[PDB]
Design a protein around this ligand. Structure first.
Ligand SMILES: CCCCCCCCCCCCCCCCCC(=O)OC[C@H](CO[C@@H]1O[C@H](CO)[C@H](O)[C@H](O)[C@H]1O)OC(=O)CCCCCCCCCCCCCCCCC
Ligand SMILES: CCCCCCCCCCCCCCCCCC(=O)O[C@@H](COC(=O)CCCCCCCCCCCCCCC)COP(=O)(O)OC[C@H](O)CO
Ligand SMILES: CCCCCCCCCCCCCCCCCC(=O)O[C@@H](COC(=O)CCCCCCCCCCCCCCC)COP(=O)(O)OC[C@H](O)CO
Ligand SMILES: CCCCCCCCCCCCCCCCCC(=O)O[C@@H](COC(=O)CCCCCCCCCCCCCCC)COP(=O)(O)OC[C@H](O)CO
Ligand SMILES: CCCCCCCCCCCCCCCCCC(=O)O[C@@H](COC(=O)CCCCCCCCCCCCCCC)COP(=O)(O)OC[C@H](O)CO
Ligand SMILES: CCCCCCCCCCCCCCCCCC(=O)O[C@@H](COC(=O)CCCCCCCCCCCCCCC)COP(=O)(O)OC[C@H](O)CO
Ligand SMILES: CCCCCCCCCCCCCCCCCC(=O)O[C@@H](COC(=O)CCCCCCCCCCCCCCC)COP(=O)(O)OC[C@H](O)CO
Ligand SMILES: CC(C)=CCC/C(C)=C/CC/C(C)=C/CC/C(C)=C/CC/C(C)=C/CC/C(C)=C/CC/C(C)=C/CC1=CC(=O)C(C)=C(C)C1=O
Ligand code: SF4
Lengths: 55, 100, 48, 350, 115, 165, 202, 109, 156, 176
């Protein structure tokens, strides 16, 4: 009967650890530079064979 | 002040609840009108405790107990309503006159 | 296919998934247990 | 009719209206802040920029949203009921706004230090799910009906652990008033916070408040992937903005009650250590002391505004059955045990 | 007085949605049409009007919640008077909490709290 | 550069009287606006308040604006192999809109979007268009800038020396 | 000759401070919060997803996607509209509250694109179904081109006056007769895989 | 005065202190906060971003006034473009091809 | 392109075949990513959508450098490919692989053991192997029922 | 310890009108959902009346418990009734309602002829010693806690037994 409570304890701490792991993985992206290209103030240079308007 | 008007409203509620207790074709509505009657009684108790019992607050305690009893009734039914709907698939109480 | 016994899959064992790290679990559990014991001690001491 | 005291009472009504209007203005401003903060935190943890063009740094984005919803055509359902449709969000926002009457930002910067206190906050916060059910029924939509039923179930599940967690704090502070709770915390300083003395109630209060605010992972009545918009599916114009305000106001009031009940509120001092900075902060009294108290309260509120805004954008969302299981089988017995432990520890005081 | 501010705040809080509705009525245009007023059903035409009729065994926690709300309401005045009185109210409310726990155990074991 | 650059580019400025005076004096106006757009409507709105009706012309598919705007022009609708090639004739756009305007209208304003793609001579013709058609005003977005600034289109096209602002 | 004609109208209003600045501020507010419908049909929606993502951000313009039509200002039609989908598209557009804006993105939404020639169910352009403000050419248009189309839509939105409101409400003319057709119930009743094992019928 | 209030300060000193608090809160600190948000927008770590957002959350009533009267639009690449119709002297000293997060440092922003 | 080239008995050069294998595997990576995104969105997590898009944009950049467009490449041709790989493509793809392995480890750290994700996913849609074979399932659907059936190794 | 006089009387009249409207909505609506929502208005008005008199704890208890009760009532009325039925809309009038209307009017007249004839202010000046509060008990909720804990012990445990048995009976009866 006590072993059931012990198992409930160990299967609760694990969930808290993995929730904290998700939080840490997500919040570690705040220290990384943004990848956003700020169009229209910034424009990505197209490839040498980009297919756009016909000339 | 016109505090006695509250008493008048309580009486009105009682009568209205009483009316809603009789013409009820839905037992959920009958339970709601029972709550209305108990609410009128509680209004009388609270205003009487305000009038005469500013220290002991016996009317307020009685109001709390009446609210507890009303919630106990509201827990017992609609569980009774649940049994009735599981057995008959109908709620209209005036249509059930087998025992007469 | 429901009445056929040859339809039961028999392909060996799947590639095992990565093992698990259990140390931080014990660290979190120790932190929470110490927090609760500190709560007990603090409540008893500050109540007096 | 005495025209000596009548003018005095009229000016007194003006002098109690003035705090109400500045609090309301700050409340709407704070909703704007929470919208901007949620967008920018999501952009930061998703490696984006967020609102940039509506104002200098997206500052005017939420104001633009509000004025757009003001200028958006009010759309009513022909199949459903108009009165319930109009009444629902108003009831929700009224019952959520009524909880700001008792929040102290200082020892006397409280609109009303009602001795009923936090119990009245629970009582008025119980009323909003009736408005959500009214919105779900009046919209005459299956998604709206499901959202209303889910909101009612969520509130039923998570009203009780929050009530018991507030009851334990009130038992510890021996009073239901928020100012009394904050001062009882401030008696022992930084170690006197109820966060250290009541950790179990702290976690259960966080989870229950997140469920009542309907933030993720407890966003089931408004879950966009399961129902199109939940109870807000048929709502257009200013009413959707009302059901948005009410949500962010609930988040703000939950964070404020976290920093009041469990953190020290405006208090920031360590009497057991020779902290020169904390002692010099607590030595200030007057206008500057109240300003520093407001600053401390806002910082502690922003901590538990930052945490759930992150929580929405990190975790997956729960399921209805699992929400009920967590509310009724993991939080309620734990809150009962916390109340029992609080009473057993409080037996030493008397 | 500590409660006239409550009444004024309640009046203002009730007035605010009325002001929002009036401002939307005098600012936003009206362009109603028979397609616009139809109930939204993800594009497709809605069938019969709403209505779900849940099972009873799902919604049997509400009957527990009604009783537990009363129990938690009754526990507050005891906590308010726990310090003025002594262990007498502790013994008094211990039976209340024990009955609450026993009722929770009964609801757990009988399957009322199962979905 | 800073100070003035980082100070208010708010859209409550009193430049609107000067804008209307310039659009009345200089018939053809080149306009420069924020990259994200939406700050041009404050200036076109007052022109529409005076009775001017707008004709939106995209300069990318304009196609030799002389015969596109001031003459009947041949255009071939796109067959997808199911039809033989048909040569349709379209009326002169600005003149059709001019003769079809109500009598109470102040005139027509030709809003030439993305006019940077046009060559020099096309901008010359777009600047000299109001001389041929008296009741036509020309507005051409010739680029983008942090703040809305306008110049005479003849100055940009090269008919007038570019005086320093 | 398919000619054009201006109807008879009155003078606008003219105002000094209140109405003009109120209209300008309303236009600016509707500029920066053009919430899209999150309407996705086909491959172009993937590029729409690329405009929700991190490299090109929807949030810089505001433009938070809202699932319900009642909370959406802009419908950004991404994908071919088949005969089976076109009535649903028109409902979704109609259920959106005024003022509402439409951007036809993709060659399949402007004129049908590759399916303009041999497809027996592709609607050749949603301009036959919904009034389109800005046309966006290109098969998977680059997300920057989508932002440019949204910028042009903002350029047109900021030019609006109060008069445009009475250009937006429908005239709502109707005509009702009996049809003597055959009324039949829906074929798709929702019954599927229930009691399937008893449906053999040898 | 009235019974219940005790040792209240003089109104002129309370007014002066509230005025200096409003001066620091409404027209001094929001400019520094928005400049600290504009500059160092890409140099933030988690702690600096948290404190930036905390200060914005606290001082937003003072930022809501200054925000309509400020623009933070990005500047042209060359520091010679006085006007949108101005031409660069030599179009080679500009820096073209700014990289992004997978292959850029803080110098490329 | 391999239907008619098998009908006409057209051989494919080894370099074109290797380029085809590389492009097919990159497209498989991108498709699995943009499956993981909407899947976790439907579960309730919206951040993994942006997280996959951060690297699917890199895949798009590789495709646009090689084929000329992000999607709708029109790169595969009968009896070969449209054009050879551009200069400096091998090292770029190798660096992408090195970065994407780290990104995949981050995804598995964030998602795989999450308690809410597991409790939403652990016991839904149990499909037998016999049912998977009879229903005509293929790929990850059929392979997730105890069946090791991949048409890359069966058909060579 | 009260509101200003005219404000108090105006609040009394306004909340009484709201209570009358809510009760009439309860007893005139066919839909149990609509009548339940009118009952909620009655509950809110009654809680405001409690706040008006002196009851700041009884009002909160009323709000909490009765709001839970009406939420449960709406759930079980949705679950135990036919289609949504917005068309039902003020159920029809029969003779059996007309006779009971007269009976209830007579009952209300009998009650109000006693309320309007009794000088309720005269009783207040006779119960002087019942209105001398203990000076140490400033908090009214503190007085209600003390008098609930000490004066009423037997009902305090009887209500616990009642709630437990009601919970058990509700679970046993309503189970499928
Ligand atoms: C801020 C707090 C953010 C995390 C709170 C979200 C809810 C939550 O923890 O549910 C996530 C999981 C859901 O866990 C589920 O529900 C029950 C909870 O014990 C049982 O354990 C179930 O078996 C388990 O599957 O909750 C936990 O396991 C407790 C974690 C406590 C974290 C603190
Ligand atoms: C459930 C609530 C959230 C839990 C998880 C929160 C996220 C934890 C942080 C994950 C990202 C780590 C970033 C590492 C930064 C490296 C540089 C640095 O400053 O490192 C210090 C880390 O600096 C920090 O404190 C990181 C910022 C955390 C506060 C912001 C998040 C609030 C939520 C090292 O000191 P420490 O680890 O001892 O500090 C923590 C300790 O408790 C201090 O006494
Ligand atoms: C928005 C958050 C900012 C802080 C809000 C503090 C609360 C508030 O604005 O109200 C108090 C503010 O108190 C003040 O008077 C301060 C005014 C300036 C507030 C600046 C913020 C009321 O306290 P009081 O005792 O004066 O209440 C009225 C009293 O009973 C007489 O009618
Ligand atoms: C005088 C009140 C109007 C006002 O200040 O106008 C601004 C605010 O008015 C509104 O748009 C309405 C909101 C009211 C505040 C609009 O300017 P903006 O902040 O959008 O543009 C400045 C810059 O170019 C970008 O930051
Ligand atoms: C950000 C805004 C600035 C910070 C908050 C300012 C107000 C907080 C300090 C005052 C309220 C809390 C302490 C209560 C005691 C006190 O100092 O009250 C003053 C409350 O002061 C005010 O009335 C408010 C000052 C203006 C509000 C801000 C501008 C005294 O003025 P009085 O009018 O009650 O008495 C003055 C005289 O002797 C006549 O009685
Ligand atoms: C201080 C905190 C005190 C309470 C500890 C936390 C709450 C109990 C932890 C155990 C728990 O959550 O139970 C699990 C594990 O519990 C077990 O040991 C499984 C068997 C359950 C037996 C029937 C229910 C009785 C459980 C009573 C638990 C305590 C009741 C409240 C005590 C305050 C789940 O069981 P279930 O509800 O899914 O079981 C029902 C199922 O059909 C199996 O019968
Ligand atoms: C806050 C209270 C707001 C005021 C409520 C009463 C409004 C004035 C009376 C109008 C009657 C009314 O609202 O009735 C509706 C029902 O009223 C309610 O349910 C509203 C009261 C619930 C208040 C909840 C408080 C908690 C619908 O019935 P109807 O006959 O008017 O409907 C006509 C048609 O079908 C279009 O709807
Ligand atoms: C200033 C006070 C005056 C002086 C007048 C009051 C103005 C006011 C403050 C008006 C209402 C403003 C709110 C306050 C307006 C509505 C704001 C919500 C609150 C807007 C909803 C916008 C979403 C649409 C916001 C959150 C949101 C962000 C996001 O990134 C994603 C992906 C999703 C799905 C979201 O829901
Ligand atoms: S342009 Fe048309 S055919 Fe091409 S992906 Fe988009 S919807 Fe499909």
């Amino acid at each position: 009967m006590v072993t059931g409570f012990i198992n409930y304890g160990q299967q609760t701490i694990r969930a808290a650890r993995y929730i904290g792991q998700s939080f840490m993985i997500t919040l570690s992206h705040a220290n990384r530079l943004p990848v956003t290209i700020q169009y229209p103030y910034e424009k990505l240079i197209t490839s040498e064979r980009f297919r756009g308007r016909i000339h | 002040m016109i505090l006695e008007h509250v008493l008048v409203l309580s009486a009105f509620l009682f009568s209205i609840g009483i009316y809603g207790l009789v013409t009820s074709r839905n037992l959920v509505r009958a339970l709601m009108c029972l709550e209305l009657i108990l609410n009128a009684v509680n209004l009388n108790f609270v205003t009487f405790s305000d009038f005469f019992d500013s220290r002991q607050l016996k009317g307020n305690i009685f109001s709390i107990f009446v609210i507890a009893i009303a919630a106990a009734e509201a827990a017992i039914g609609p569980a009774i309503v649940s049994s009735i709907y599981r057995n008959r698939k109908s709620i209209r109480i005036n249509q059930s006159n087998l025992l007469n | 296919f429901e009445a056929d016994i040859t339809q039961t899959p028999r392909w060996g064992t799947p590639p095992p998934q990565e093992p698990e790290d259990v140390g931080p679990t014990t660290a979190v559990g120790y932190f929470l247990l110490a927090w609760f014991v500190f709560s007990f001690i603090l409540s008893i001491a500050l109540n007096r | 009719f005495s025209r000596l005291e009548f003018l005095k009472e009229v000016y007194e009504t003006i002098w109690m209206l003035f705090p109400i209007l500045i609090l309301v203005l700050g409340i709407t401003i704070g909703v704007l802040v929470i919208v901007w903060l949620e967008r920018e935190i999501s952009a930061s943890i998703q490696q984006r920029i967020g609102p940039e063009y509506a104002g200098p740094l997206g500052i005017l984005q939420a104001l633009a949203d509000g004025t757009k919803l003001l200028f958006k055509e009010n759309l009513l359902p022909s199949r459903g009921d108009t009165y319930l449709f109009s009444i629902g969000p108003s009831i929700a926002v009224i019952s959520i706004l009524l909880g700001y009457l008792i929040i102290p930002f200082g020892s006397r910067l409280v609109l009303a230090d009602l001795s009923i206190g936090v119990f009245l906050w629970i009582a008025v916060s119980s009323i909003a799910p009736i408005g959500l059910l009214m919105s779900g029924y009046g919209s005459n939509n299956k998604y709206s009906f499901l959202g209303g039923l889910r909101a009612a179930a969520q509130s039923i599940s998570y009203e009780i652990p929050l009530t018991l967690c507030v009851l334990s704090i009130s038992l510890l502070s021996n009073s239901s008033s928020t100012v009394d709770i904050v001062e009882a915390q401030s008696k022992y300083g930084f170690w006197g916070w109820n966060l250290w003395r009541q950790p179990i109630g702290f976690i259960v209060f966080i989870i229950s408040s997140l469920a009542e605010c309907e933030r993720l992972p407890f966003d089931l009545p408004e879950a966009e992937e399961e129902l199109v918009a939940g109870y807000q599916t048929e709502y257009s114009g200013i009413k959707f903005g009302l059901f948005y305000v009410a949500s962010y106001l609930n988040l703000l009031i939950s964070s404020l009650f976290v920093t009041v009940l469990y953190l020290g509120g405006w208090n920031l001092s360590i009497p057991y250590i020779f902290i020169s900075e904390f002692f010099e902060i607590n030595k200030i009294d007057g206008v500057f002391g109240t300003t520093i108290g407001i600053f401390i309260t806002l910082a502690k509120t922003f901590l538990f505004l930052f945490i759930p805004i992150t929580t929405r954008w990190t975790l997956p969302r729960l399921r209805m059955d699992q929400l009920l299981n967590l509310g009724w089988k993991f939080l309620l017995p734990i809150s009962l045990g916390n109340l029992l432990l609080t009473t057993s520890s409080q037996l030493f005081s008397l | 007085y500590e409660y006239d501010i409550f009444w004024a705040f309640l009046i203002i809080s009730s007035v605010i949605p009325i002001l929002a509705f009036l401002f939307s009525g005098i600012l936003a245009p009206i362009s109603k049409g028979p397609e616009k007023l139809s109930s939204y059903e993800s594009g497709i035409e809605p069938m019969g009007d709403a209505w779900l009729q849940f099972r009873i065994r799902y919604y049997m926690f509400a009957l527990v919640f009604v009783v537990f709300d009363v129990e938690t309401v009754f526990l507050y005045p005891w906590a308010m008077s726990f310090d003025i009185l002594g262990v007498s109210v502790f013994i008094e409310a211990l039976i209340f909490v024990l009955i609450l726990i026993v009722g929770l155990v009964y609801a757990w074991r009988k399957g009322a709290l199962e979905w | 550069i800073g100070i003035r650059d980082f100070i208010g580019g708010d859209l409550v400025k009193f430049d609107l009287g000067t804008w209307l005076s310039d659009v009345e004096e200089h018939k053809a106006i080149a306009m420069y606006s924020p990259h994200e757009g939406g700050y041009e409507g404050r200036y076109l709105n007052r022109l529409r308040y005076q009775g001017y009706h707008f004709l939106d012309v995209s300069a990318r598919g304009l196609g030799d604006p002389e015969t596109t705007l001031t003459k009947v022009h041949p255009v071939c609708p796109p067959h997808v192999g199911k039809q033989p090639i048909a040569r349709w004739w379209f009326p002169p756009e600005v003149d059709y809109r001019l003769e079809a305007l109500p009598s109470d209208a102040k005139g027509l304003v030709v809003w030439v979007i993305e006019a940077k793609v046009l060559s020099k001579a096309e901008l010359q013709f777009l600047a000299m268009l109001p001389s041929l058609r008296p009741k036509v005003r020309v507005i051409a977005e010739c680029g983008n800038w942090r703040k809305v600034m306008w110049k005479p289109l003849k100055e940009i096209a090269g008919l007038v020396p570019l005086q320093e602002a | 000759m398919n000619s054009i004609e201006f109807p008879l109208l009155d003078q606008i209003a003219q105002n000094s401070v209140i109405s003009t600045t109120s209209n300008d501020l309303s236009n600016w507010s509707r500029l920066s919060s053009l919430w899209p419908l999150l309407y996705g049909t086909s491959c172009c929606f993937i590029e729409f997803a690329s405009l929700i993502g991190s490299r090109f951000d929807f949030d810089r313009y505001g433009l938070v996607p809202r699932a319900s039509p009642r909370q959406a200002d802009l419908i950004l039609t991404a994908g071919t509209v088949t005969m089976k989908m076109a009535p649903s598209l028109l409902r979704l557009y109609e259920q959106m509250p005024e003022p509402k804006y439409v951007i036809a993105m993709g060659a399949c939404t402007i004129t049908g694109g590759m399916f303009s020639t041999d497809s027996y169910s592709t609607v050749r352009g949603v301009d036959k179904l919904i009034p389109v403000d800005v046309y966006l050419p290109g098969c998977p248009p680059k997300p920057e081109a989508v932002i440019d189309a949204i910028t042009k839509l903002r350029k047109k939105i900021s030019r609006e006056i109060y008069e445009d409101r009475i250009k937006s409400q429908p005239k709502n003319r109707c005509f009702t007769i009996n049809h003597k057709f055959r009324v039949g119930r829906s074929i798709h009743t929702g019954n599927y895989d229930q009691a399937l094992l008893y449906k053999y019928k040898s | 005065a009235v019974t219940g209030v005790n040792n209240q300060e003089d109104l002129i000193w309370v007014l002066l202190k509230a005025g200096v608090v409003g001066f620091c809160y409404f027209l001094i600190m929001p400019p520094i906060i928005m400049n600290w948000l504009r500059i160092r927008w890409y140099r933030r770590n988690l702690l600096e971003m948290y404190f930036q957002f905390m200060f914005v959350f606290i001082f937003f009533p003072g930022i809501l006034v200054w925000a309509p009267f400020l623009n933070f639009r990005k500047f042209p690449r060359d520091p010679t473009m006085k006007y949108p119709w101005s031409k660069p002297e030599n179009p080679s000293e500009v820096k073209g091809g700014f990289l992004k997060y997978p292959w850029a440092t803080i110098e490329d922003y | 392109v391999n239907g008619p080239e098998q009908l006409g008995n057209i051989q494919v050069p080894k370099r074109a075949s290797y380029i085809r294998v590389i492009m097919l595997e990159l497209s498989r990576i991108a498709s699995h990513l943009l499956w993981l995104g909407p899947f976790m969105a439907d579960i309730g997590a919206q951040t993994p959508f942006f997280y996959i898009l951060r690297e699917r944009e890199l895949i798009y950049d590789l495709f646009e450098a090689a084929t000329g467009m992000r999607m709708m490449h029109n790169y595969f041709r009968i009896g070969g490919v449209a054009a050879d790989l551009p200069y400096g493509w091998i090292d770029k793809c190798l660096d992408f692989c090195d970065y994407f392995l780290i990104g995949l480890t981050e995804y598995q750290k964030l998602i795989t053991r999450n308690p809410i994700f597991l409790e939403r996913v652990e016991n839904v849609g149990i499909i037998g192997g016999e049912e998977a074979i009879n229903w005509g399932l293929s790929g990850p659907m059929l392979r997730a029922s105890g069946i090791q059936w991949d048409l890359r190794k069966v058909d060579h | 310890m009260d509101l200003p006089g005219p404000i108090h009387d105006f609040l009394l009249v306004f909340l009484g009108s709201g209570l009358i409207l809510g009760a009439l909505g309860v007893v005139l609506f066919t839909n149990p959902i609509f009548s339940a929502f009118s009952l909620g208005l009655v509950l809110v008005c009654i809680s405001l009346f409690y706040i008006l008199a002196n009851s700041h704890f009884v009002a909160s208890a009323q709000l909490l418990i009765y709001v839970g009760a009406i939420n449960v009532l709406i759930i079980f009325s949705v679950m135990f009734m036919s289609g949504p039925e917005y068309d039902k809309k003020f159920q029809l009038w029969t003779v059996g309602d007309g006779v009971t209307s007269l009976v209830c009017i007579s009952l209300f007249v009998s009650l109000i002829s006693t309320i309007l004839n009794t000088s309720w202010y005269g009783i207040i000046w006779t119960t002087k010693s019942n209105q001398i509060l203990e000076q140490d008990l400033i908090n009214a909720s503190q007085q209600i806690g003390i008098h609930l804990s000490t004066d009423f012990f037997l009902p305090f445990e009887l209500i616990s037994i009642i709630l437990l048995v009601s919970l058990i009976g509700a679970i046993a009866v309503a189970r499928q």
